[PDB]
Amino acid sequence: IGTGFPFDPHYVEVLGERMHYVDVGPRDGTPVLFLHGNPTSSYVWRNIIPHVAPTHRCIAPDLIGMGKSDKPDLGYFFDDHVRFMDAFIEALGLEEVVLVIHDWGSALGFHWAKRNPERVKGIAFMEFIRPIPTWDEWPEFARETFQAFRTTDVGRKLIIDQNVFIEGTLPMGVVRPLTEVEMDHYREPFLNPVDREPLWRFPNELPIAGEPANIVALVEEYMDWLHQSPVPKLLFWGTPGVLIPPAEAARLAKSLPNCKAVDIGPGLNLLQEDNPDLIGSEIARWLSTLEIS
Ligand SMILES: *CCCCCCOCCOCCNC(=O)c1c(F)c(F)c(C(=O)O)c(C2=C3C=CC(=[N+]4CCC4)C=C3[Si](C)(C)c3cc(N4CCC4)ccc32)c1F
Ligand SMILES: [Cl-]
């Protein structure tokens, strides 16, 4: 499993800030937009993009405040991410896209798709944000930690002061061990504690047990949209999962129209780090099937 990030930096001005993105593959055709979540960057896509790049343009931005993107003094609310990702997409002049989305990148992608349904030709998604009706529907092993994250004094001490999301939670969302080189790539954007705001706001935005109400509403609205939409869908899932346990993937594979589900074997949250060759190969082959009517 490759540790290298062999992609030239691309930058675009977005709302008076600069965002970093990977941009590889042919210039023409429908682009494939890859959206990472918490607490990763375009680095999470590094071993999946090589399967897609031969046939499609691959675009993998770093969310505002993350990766090699700028770090303005925001609260990094989901609303901030929405504002910046909307402006990113318009800044590149993207018309129709295929979405490949994960964790908070999936909340961005589904929310955008809902608002721009004629521009989304396909969605591949994994370990995505859905409402977690109660804390019992959150994995027991992660329950105490995410409950602690979702306070101001304790949460901010763990995530901002001690960097527990990067040093602890991240490696514990992968079944295989992350190497030191991989950890250093994930650490790089957050070496300065003041830049860790996004790592703390994100778990505080998770729609868990009806809170926060604004995120719960927005997430229910896109999961309704997704159940009504004929858009081609590709769902990767792992055992035991974190956001998406196997029973939920089984349910969505049937409830979502035009949905193919693929089992990656053992995984938790960062499925990309446990089976990148399967995810990359299935995306590439599924993209080809979008052109078979
Ligand atoms: C969008 C949704 C994203 C989900 C991504 C994450 O998926 C859920 C995974 O949740 C894991 C929750 N658990 C922890 O974060 C955690 C602990 F609760 C915990 F008690 C400990 C611990 O100290 O034992 C660790 C942990 C840490 C914690 C802190 C830390 N540092 C601060 C400076 C260094 C380092 C670690 Si490490 C990588 C040495 C570690 C290793 C293990 N194992 C089991 C075999 C090696 C276990 C825990 C920790 C937590 F990460
Ligand atoms: Cl999170």
Numbering used by the authors: 4 to 296
Task: Reproduce, without paraphrasing, sentences from the article in which this PDB structure was first reported.
Here we describe WHaloCaMP, a modular chemigenetic calcium indicator built from bright dye-ligands and protein sensor domains. Fluorescence change in WHaloCaMP results from reversible quenching of the bound dye via a strategically placed tryptophan. When bound to a near-infrared dye-ligand, WHaloCaMP shows a 7× increase in fluorescence intensity and a 2.1-ns increase in fluorescence lifetime upon calcium binding.
This dye-ligand has emission just on the edge of the near-infrared and has previously been reported to efficiently label neurons in mouse brains following intravascular injection. Thus, the excellent bioavailability of the JF669-HaloTag ligand is at the expense of environmental sensitivity; this dye-ligand does not exhibit large Ca2+-dependent fluorescence changes when used with the previously published HaloCaMP sensors. We next sought to couple the fluorescence quenching of HaloTag-bound JF669 to Ca2+-induced conformational changes in the protein. We explored different topologies of peptide calmodulin (CaM) insertions into HaloTagG171W at positions spatially proximal to the bound dye and screened for insertions that retained a high dye-ligand-capture rate close to that of HaloTag7 (above 106 M−1 s−1)17 to ensure good labeling with dye-ligand following bolus loading into complex tissue. Insertion of the myosin light-chain kinase (MLCK) CaM-binding peptide followed by CaM at position R179 of HaloTag7G171W resulted in a protein with a fast dye-ligand-capture rate and a modest Ca2+-dependent change in fluorescence.
